[PDB]
Amino acid sequence: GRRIQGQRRGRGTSTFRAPSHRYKADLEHRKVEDGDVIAGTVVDIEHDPARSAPVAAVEFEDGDRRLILAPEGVGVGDELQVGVSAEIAPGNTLPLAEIPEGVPVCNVESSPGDGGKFARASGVNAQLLTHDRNVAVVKLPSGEMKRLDPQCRATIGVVAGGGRTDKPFVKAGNKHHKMKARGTKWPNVRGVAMNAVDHPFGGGGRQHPGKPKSISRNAPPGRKVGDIASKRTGRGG
Amino acid sequence: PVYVDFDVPADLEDDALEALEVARDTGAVKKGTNETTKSIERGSAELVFVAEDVQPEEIVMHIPELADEKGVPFIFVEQQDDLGHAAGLEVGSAAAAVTDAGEADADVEDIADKVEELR
Amino acid sequence: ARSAYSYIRDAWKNPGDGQLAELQWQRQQEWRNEGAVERIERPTRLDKARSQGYKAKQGVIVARVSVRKGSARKRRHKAGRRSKRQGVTRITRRKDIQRVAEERASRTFPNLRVLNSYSVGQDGRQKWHEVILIDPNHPAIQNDDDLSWICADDQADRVFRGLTGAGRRNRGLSGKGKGSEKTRPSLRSNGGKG
Amino acid sequence: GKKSKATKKRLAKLDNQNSRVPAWVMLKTDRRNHKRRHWRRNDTDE
RNA sequence: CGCACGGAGGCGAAGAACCACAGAUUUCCGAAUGAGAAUCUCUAACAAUUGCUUCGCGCAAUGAGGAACCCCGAGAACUGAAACAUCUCAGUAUCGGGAGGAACAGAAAACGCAACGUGAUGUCGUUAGUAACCGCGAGUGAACGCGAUACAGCCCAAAC
């Protein structure tokens, strides 16, 4: 047959790429040597095309102007601190070790110094639960208990733009505008609606996947479609 | 370094090189790793010098153990060019051997003894 | 008596034992951080180089080349083939890694000609070989009685035509009798059945 | 379109070639430009 | 005073034309090399990779071409087997790299008419569709030797 869509993606052609030339910046944490003597002022609030959420422009003491992964409640004029001795306040960044237990955090680093990997989307937040000298236990937005190095930096508060998912797109055209801002081919044609040559579910008079949808983890690309290694399906049970 | 098992003080090395210089003007010395090797093998060597900046180390690796099983005493020199100059060469020398000293027999003998104490 | 060289030789007979083992363990850390072709001032295996034709003269160059370890890196068939011509994983190339190394070196030094080469070890993912190259245009070599032969026109790009010792061995030209029916005088003239 | 200096030289040459065989050549050879081109009917290069 | 049988004019005994050999001139693009460009442009140039090095592009090398032949790599299918998969077509077509006027090979860790014998290597004739291979099917297929051609043997590494 012919390579299915999921395989066309891999090639990374224009159709499947994200509009990077239109993107603003990666909201990574500042790199401070030590001393914490790095504070700045929120100079402006901007819209981030890549995340459909507001982001804050900060002007630091040492003359650095950088965009920041902004939590809810950050406003122009406000002073932000980044470092070990940072004040425990919303919008401030400091290692998990310096953060008190039971405090909502966002833009959490996976490995100290990476700039932040977890809890970055609209309205989400990680919850700092347990402390230690060797490991900080954080509950991620998915509900997973994650063990992290206490030296991993994070921002206090939840990510701005919460509730975005609460309003329906209502019309195709609205979805359209959003997809243009992402690395995604849209709209979506069902496998069962294509010819047998184009997808494992294509062909046959009436539309129907002529086989069970739960596919093995070991299935090769081109065959791995439908319900990937499902532990179960449906709503019952 | 893989062949070096002890550090020789800069002062001992100075004396040793001076001893080597008067050994060539008076007695006889061997210049070059091959010639030095045969001396230790024929037993004609009284004191062998080995540079420490020899790359690759293969060239000299064998000297230390070969000298040990032949009773022949050895000493290290930090630089290859110095050993070569002391032997009276425009070029460097990875290893050298004072085959029968000359008007420095007492000095050479002391140097050997100073090394023994130094492991 | 034994030459000093015989000791370098004897050490290299068992690269995994003695001082050589520690030397290699140290060196490879540096080699892995080096490029594909690194010119070196002195051969790592002096005895082997001199034995192969090396001389501490002008126009003699030694370079260490690293090549990925293992079999062929082959692309699977687009069009239809019989099961016999479908395989992809176990198929290996007909040229050995040492030969690939010699060619990469000669390409880096276009004006020079490959004289010979030898192995200097390998790790789990790559192999290293040191190639001896000669400058056929330098008078110190045109006047050398033991090397001036490499200056001849027919010796140009000798490595690319399989004229190196590794080339000749790989072409099955070692044996003068039984087994060399399809190798001598050339693989091509014997219908490429060697 | 916009022609470069080089293109212009080429077009100019093509125009010059597009002439009739001189009359004196007819007499000399005792009896037709096989390359006569028309702007509309034919097509030049580039 | 070309092909080229016109007109006008001119050159040649100051030996022209014509021919051989040698030399001069030889625009731009082109490996194309100062940077760039559909044959042009812009502001001193071995661009790039190398060797030597007076460490300065100072001295040099490479690049690209050529009818096929040649050497080293990559390597089909149609086809045959009256299907077809091993096998066959075939190491063929085609691709990548490279040399020369020819390439390649070549002075035995050979041969093994087993010998008290031959004596580097190609190639030609033969050995022979033999030995060997093979859904032991279809098919594939040497060698030693012999008769010829031409003949030529040497250099390192190490010991000292």
Place this chain on the structure above:
RNA sequence: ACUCGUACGGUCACUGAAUCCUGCCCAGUGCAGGUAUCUGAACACCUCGUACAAGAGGACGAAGGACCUGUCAACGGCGGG
């Protein structure tokens, strides 16, 4: 490539606005998890064999399978008497 992206994400699929709803079946097939015991290759190991080798057998046993379990908005099924 996705990705200047990080679960309010994005990947893979099915259905196809709203409204009222969406029953029964895990035997087969698929996916997933577990598994005392059974089965389960090669290397190394052990026995026989060979002055060696081919080879025969043994012990151990991964994933997998047997076996158990979960699962139908998973493939699908919901008859005759």
Place this chain on the structure above:
RNA sequence: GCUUUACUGCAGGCUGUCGCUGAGGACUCUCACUCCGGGAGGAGGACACCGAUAGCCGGGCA
């Protein structure tokens, strides 16, 4: 051309084993190797990656 529990194979995934690979049937360490860090340094670690092979799945492909 297409399909599949047709025949025969090939990718690919999973899994064991050998090499890379080091020191003191369960373990500790650091020194290769890997990852984070501008750096110092931190995390991990003889595993993982990679080469080789073996068993299972394997119309994704011929």
